[PDB]
Design a protein around this ligand. Sequence first.
Ligand SMILES: *[C@@H]1O[C@H](CO)[C@@H](O[C@@H]2O[C@H](CO)[C@@H](O[C@@H]3O[C@H](CO)[C@@H](O)[C@H](O)[C@@H]3O)[C@H](O)[C@H]2NC(C)=O)[C@H](O)[C@H]1NC(C)=O
Ligand SMILES: *[C@@H]1O[C@H](CO)[C@@H](O[C@@H]2O[C@H](CO)[C@@H](O[C@@H]3O[C@H](CO)[C@@H](O)[C@H](O)[C@@H]3O)[C@H](O)[C@H]2NC(C)=O)[C@H](O)[C@H]1NC(C)=O
Ligand SMILES: *[C@@H]1O[C@H](CO)[C@@H](O[C@@H]2O[C@H](CO)[C@@H](O[C@@H]3O[C@H](CO)[C@@H](O)[C@H](O)[C@@H]3O)[C@H](O)[C@H]2NC(C)=O)[C@H](O)[C@H]1NC(C)=O
Ligand SMILES: *[C@@H]1O[C@H](CO)[C@@H](O[C@@H]2O[C@H](CO)[C@@H](O[C@@H]3O[C@H](CO)[C@@H](O)[C@H](O)[C@@H]3O)[C@H](O)[C@H]2NC(C)=O)[C@H](O)[C@H]1NC(C)=O
Ligand SMILES: *[C@@H]1O[C@H](CO)[C@@H](O)[C@H](O)[C@H]1NC(C)=O
Lengths: 159, 109, 96, 145, 159
Amino acid sequence: QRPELKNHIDRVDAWVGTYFEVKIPSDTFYDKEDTTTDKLKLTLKLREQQLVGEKSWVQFNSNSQLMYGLPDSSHVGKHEYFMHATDKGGLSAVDAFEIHVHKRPQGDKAPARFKAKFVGDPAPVVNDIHKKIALVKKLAFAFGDRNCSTVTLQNITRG
Amino acid sequence: QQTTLYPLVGRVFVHTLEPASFLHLPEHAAPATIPVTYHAHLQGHPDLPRWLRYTQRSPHHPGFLYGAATPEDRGRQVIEVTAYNRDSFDTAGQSLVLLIRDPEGSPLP
Amino acid sequence: KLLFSADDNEVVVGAERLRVLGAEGTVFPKSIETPNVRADPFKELRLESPTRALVMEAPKGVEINAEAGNMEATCRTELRLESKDGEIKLDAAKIK
Amino acid sequence: GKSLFTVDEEEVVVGTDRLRVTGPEGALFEHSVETPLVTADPFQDLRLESPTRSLSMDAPRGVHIEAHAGEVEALSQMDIVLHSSDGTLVLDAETVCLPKLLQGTQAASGSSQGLYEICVCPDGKLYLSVAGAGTTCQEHSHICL
Amino acid sequence: TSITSDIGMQFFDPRTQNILFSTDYETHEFHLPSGVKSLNVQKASTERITSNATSDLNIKVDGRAIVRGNEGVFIMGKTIEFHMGGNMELKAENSIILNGTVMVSTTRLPSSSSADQLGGGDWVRYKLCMCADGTLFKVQVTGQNVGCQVSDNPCGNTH
Ligand SMILES: *[C@@H]1O[C@H](CO)[C@@H](O[C@@H]2O[C@H](CO)[C@@H](O[C@@H]3O[C@H](CO)[C@@H](O)[C@H](O)[C@@H]3O)[C@H](O)[C@H]2NC(C)=O)[C@H](O)[C@H]1NC(C)=O
Ligand SMILES: *[C@@H]1O[C@H](CO)[C@@H](O[C@@H]2O[C@H](CO)[C@@H](O[C@@H]3O[C@H](CO)[C@@H](O)[C@H](O)[C@@H]3O)[C@H](O)[C@H]2NC(C)=O)[C@H](O)[C@H]1NC(C)=O
Ligand SMILES: *[C@@H]1O[C@H](CO)[C@@H](O[C@@H]2O[C@H](CO)[C@@H](O[C@@H]3O[C@H](CO)[C@@H](O)[C@H](O)[C@@H]3O)[C@H](O)[C@H]2NC(C)=O)[C@H](O)[C@H]1NC(C)=O
Ligand SMILES: *[C@@H]1O[C@H](CO)[C@@H](O[C@@H]2O[C@H](CO)[C@@H](O[C@@H]3O[C@H](CO)[C@@H](O)[C@H](O)[C@@H]3O)[C@H](O)[C@H]2NC(C)=O)[C@H](O)[C@H]1NC(C)=O
Ligand SMILES: *[C@@H]1O[C@H](CO)[C@@H](O)[C@H](O)[C@H]1NC(C)=O
């Protein structure tokens, strides 16, 4: 049978330069043949049923059933996405959700401002969101931190 | 057609609603078959006040107007309510008169 | 930048946002002119009349789009599809 | 001497007929809004989006969608239900285009039962007749009245 | 009666020391005044639009009306009309469903008269036929006695 839906995702709150990660709730979708979300295939899609690109600032892993991302100020504001829940029966249930990306609330008056210059071209690092999230989690691990969202990159300049 | 009710501050108020006399068009044979919803609002307003709310499981089930009177809403209150039959599309305007007054007797701390 | 004016036609207030309180609603006896009506997040949108008819017009087109949903045109008398000089098509894999 | 805008400790009276707020953020109406008319400024589109939930259009007297000089566009990603409960469905157009029908192969053998053909009453009433080797609309003219 | 400053107008009743009106909008939140006939706001977040019990709502616009239902639209009414000037387009992905006792405008739709002696003789034209499960399918006509019986069912086998 076609899977059914009970709870929606209202909206996702994100901030520019901050890494967010959301695990889908276990009661998000239901099917008479499956009864659980984890035993059912979950995908993320755009308005006309196109997946997120590799270079997009938000990605989502199906096996870890985990969405994640880090937005930029050129993508501040609203955005829309669809969650598609496909069972073994080849039938898809659909939910929609909206993501609000805000500017950094502290803004310009931060009491601390860390600055560092590295080696090599920043073009592949900026062009790759994978490199960006690896960098953020690597700073977080360098401080020994768990929640990598505590890093807020503010600006990168080619030198 | 109007009806006057007497709510009091402190406890709940609930009004079971029956389409037999609420609707100007009688429902003969088995009246429980016909599905009718109800939309209740303050007169000249789109919605009930904060203290009052409305629910309905299914259109084939009676609706319910319910809420707890507040001391800040004491006095005379007017409810304009429309019986929207889910099938018969029949408009039945109705007025309810509420007199929110103080409770009588010992309080309930 | 103009932050207040009050002349013989109208009063312009240049506030960043308009924020009304009260859950009972509001009454605007004449009209609302809004270029974009958007639903509240996590909330429905409803365009209904309590006891009367609803008429809506757009001389340059109407797009009803259900990007993931249905078009449940529930009537009881007539689903009139009256085109002056155009045509009707049912673009779907199956027709029931 | 006509009042135009007044303030005091009691209220803020606006005696004019328009109140424009230019802020790019916009209004925030925390519940439903009563009005007999909604529109926009001239030569400006209006979008009624429901970005995260569904939408309904309900009228006890009827809904009349009009585009007198334009077109009605209705595409949906899912099934579309033209559910006339027990009423009629008049489709008034010069041309009806059905380019996405399944193609059938005529043969003497019958795959199964329940096969019918579409038949038209002279008044526009549409019905069905039992499918056969030839046409059977003419044999089943009882329903037409 | 113009005024000009960096901050702007102000007024507070000295008998309350409350700023009854100001124009530094970031500080004091604006509220809706009383007695307003119309308001023309460039963006509205409306839960519901409704009329009063006497007259009709009119969603009238010189521009185009784009109503989009992310989880779907439901039109409920007694007499439901669609008066378009040009073409009417009804597009679906899975299927269309026309449930009801359908009529048609016989005068408006053209009818092929038999005055011509088989001008479209032995021509590739299709006949609409009714499946058991409500589906419709077109069968090409070869001779004068082509019915709706098929062997290779495009309706699918009637499982
Ligand atoms: C931003 O700077 C703050 C420094 O204030 C970083 O937060 C700090 O994180 C460490 C964990 O790596 C906290 O250490 C604590 O140690 C005590 C010792 O008993 C233990 O009880 C705690 O459970 C924790 O392990 C430290 O307190 C905390 N500082 C706070 C909360 O003020 C933060 O990671 C930095 N974010 C970045 C660099 O993105
Ligand atoms: C963060 O990095 C950005 C980009 O490296 C810096 O913004 C840049 O600021 C310079 C200085 O004004 C801009 O140069 C000139 O800008 C004007 C317009 O303001 C333009 O007409 C000139 O042709 C020239 O490009 C540069 O455009 C601008 N880059 C942008 C906006 O992308 C910014 O200063 C850095 N901030 C911090 C805190 O490090
Ligand atoms: C009975 O239970 C209902 C539901 O919990 C109570 O109604 C709630 O009352 C609170 C406070 O009176 C309301 O909170 C207010 O919300 C507004 C926004 O609408 C906010 O601006 C205020 O600052 C305040 O936080 C709440 O909205 C309201 N909820 C509903 C659904 O009406 C009611 O008070 C309870 N009555 C008794 C006697 O216990
Ligand atoms: C329910 O909504 C209807 C539709 O707007 C209201 O009827 C209209 O009410 C307005 C304001 O009360 C009337 O405007 C004024 O009317 C007087 C005489 O009626 C006229 O001399 C003025 O120049 C001005 O136009 C409008 O005429 C009236 N229209 C009709 C057809 O009745 C009605 O008042 C609303 N009722 C409630 C209880 O909200
Ligand atoms: C990590 O930081 C976030 C701030 O976005 C906070 O919500 C979360 O609780 C932190 N993690 C832990 C383990 O406290």
